[PDB]
Design a protein around this ligand. Sequence first.
Ligand code: FES
Lengths: 85, 115, 78, 154
Amino acid sequence: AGGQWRLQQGLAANPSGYGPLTELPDWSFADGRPAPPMKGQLRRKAQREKLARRVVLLTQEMDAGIQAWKLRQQKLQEERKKEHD
Amino acid sequence: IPDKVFQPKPEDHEKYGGDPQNPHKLHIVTRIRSTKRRPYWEKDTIKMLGLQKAHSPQIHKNIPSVNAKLKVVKHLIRIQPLKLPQGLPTEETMSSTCLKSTGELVVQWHLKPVE
Amino acid sequence: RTVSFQAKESMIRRLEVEAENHYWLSMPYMTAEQECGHAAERRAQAFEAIKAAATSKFPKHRYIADQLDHLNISKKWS
Amino acid sequence: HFQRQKLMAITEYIPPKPAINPRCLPPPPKPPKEESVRLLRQDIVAVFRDNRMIAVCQNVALSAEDKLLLRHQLRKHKIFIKVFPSQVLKPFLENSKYRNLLPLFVGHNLLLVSEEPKVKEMVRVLKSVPFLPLLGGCVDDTILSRQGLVDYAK
RNA sequence: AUUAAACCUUGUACCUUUUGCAUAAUGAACUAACUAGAAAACUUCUAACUAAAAGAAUUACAGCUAGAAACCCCGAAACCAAAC
RNA sequence: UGGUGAUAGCUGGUUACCCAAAAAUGAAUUUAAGUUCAAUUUUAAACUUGCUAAAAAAACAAAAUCAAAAAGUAAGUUUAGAUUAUAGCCAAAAGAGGGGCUCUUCUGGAACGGAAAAAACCUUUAAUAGUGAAUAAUUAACAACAUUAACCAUUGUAGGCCUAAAAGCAGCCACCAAUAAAGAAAGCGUUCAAGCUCAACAUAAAAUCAAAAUUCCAUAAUUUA
RNA sequence: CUCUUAUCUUUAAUCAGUGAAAUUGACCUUUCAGUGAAGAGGCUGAAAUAUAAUAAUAAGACGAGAAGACCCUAUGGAGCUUA
Ligand code: FES
């Protein structure tokens, strides 16, 4: 319940989704030594990193997909204007 | 399907707040229904798109081939335009990326409440 | 079987969501001409890797250590 | 199927609601009046203009045949029984020489229209029917009582 | 499950067979023992040796030699011979 | 008694565990409880495109068949060996006979949730522990008003028609007048007519459909956002 | 028979001795309505309900049943006979 309101505020609809409560470590050593990263957090972290690399690669490919069109138009444009002798 | 469905009107632009120029590049799609009891062509399209698990975010290009494939499964997916307020992430910030429900992919996650 | 009030509302909400999908499909960023051949190079490379993996079947080797190591089964206190 | 029935219910036509019901509406304008009835105006206008003094007496449950006989009887008195439907009589004052004689012509009443001051003949008409009540006589188109009619008639 | 054996909550016996369904239909008082898949002509695999292989009879233009790998039970109406 | 463990395409039964893969099309058959052929599947080998999609386009008549480039994606073709399978069920579409049914063709299904119990309808990607969380389908649902209400009915003429007679009113006519208002008559009455009203005139006032035989069968309930 | 009654004997019931058979998945073995294949002690929804015993009757469930009864077919078989 309450997912719609949470979305309105920009937060995750499910409190168990993306948030500091879930993401942050749940404990630490009494001596103050940092706790090891959570296996679930690491697994979730890996997927986000993989998606980020894909997103960058796609945009790079997309940039060429449109930019190349301009380079093929320049080839077409220059081809039209031709002369010799 | 007639193209008129995908021909926007001035009111539609205001309702969705999308400018007819500078069209968005990347689509966000999530499966919201089961393919059981559906025809084989519907089943095949979902498998091809990779939306085997429901409520799973996927990165796709806003290109005619992808657009055509999405149209076939339009009723089974939710389409949200990807926004980059801070731009594309760098190699250093590749590990700090996070996609919000609003549709904006931040390149830096500071673990600070938006409040 | 008269339709419950909740049922009517739920379908209407889903219909609106599908309408939003239509609008975001109404602005194709790339035209057909630009799309052609933009990713052909990447697709070819992926197929080559697929072929190599598929044709990697072959019988396995046999090693002397396997037969010789079996003699360790008789190890005991001195 | 049930699922198809769900689609029909949602597609049901929705009627808009008027702000105010026709009965409870604010006062709206109305079309201008039209005189249909116009013929009867000419007939009454002629008889009243011709006859200065009119003796107004309530009509008892008389018969149509008697009125013709009484009409001939007045011809001996030099008076005419010219009558018409009274629902057009009230608008007579609206379009006629006078506008102020409406109270005299109230209800259904016999009208004795005479152009000459022959008092004796008018009095004789009164003597014809005692039970029939004479409201009065507008001598010279001036409102007067039955008793006043006799007094001025003298 | 529970502090608590019964109460409250959940749950349409079994085998076979019918349609991939039984509120059908068969079979079962229960206990113990007994009670139903068996063959190598050729192939793959494991090795020997090799233009040769096999301790005689066989095959051979890489073959040949050895090993391993396989196919149930109970139950008719009957038919015939010889005695009684 | 022996042949004899006769035979039986028939009936019944046929004893441990785990992982993987796995479907009642076409042709013939004393054939439809089986078997062969095609097709599938399958093992090995050879080496490279395949599946979805796919513009213009012809073909047809005036969204599939065909398949440039793509794109999404990872299998595919050929050679060699080899079997198994070869009876559905129900829902929902399109046809064809009947005119509910009888068929042919296409699509989907096999909850531990829901529609009352519910193989066939809806929501549902596998299965793991937890005294977590967000959601999906989801037995119920809130009579019809937009011309018609008071009063009166005089006269020609019982107008001509076989009608004895039919006078508004048996038939039959055409279809005028006076009057303020009279239908040469609208329903009644009719030995025939006298005679009952409706229309006449005067006086009234209005204004597009809904929510059979054992014993009833949850209980109830109209408003705190 | 109208129109049944009375008595005796057998059975019956009590005591003591001896002591089977068909049958049997397990049963902590209810009513109504629904559902279903004509169909419910065991499902759905209502209802009823100290435990255990004891004694009586055979109408219905178109009761359960068999290779019972009757008639006819087969371009079915098989057996038999021929002129
Ligand atoms: S509120 Fe009824 S007429 Fe105005």
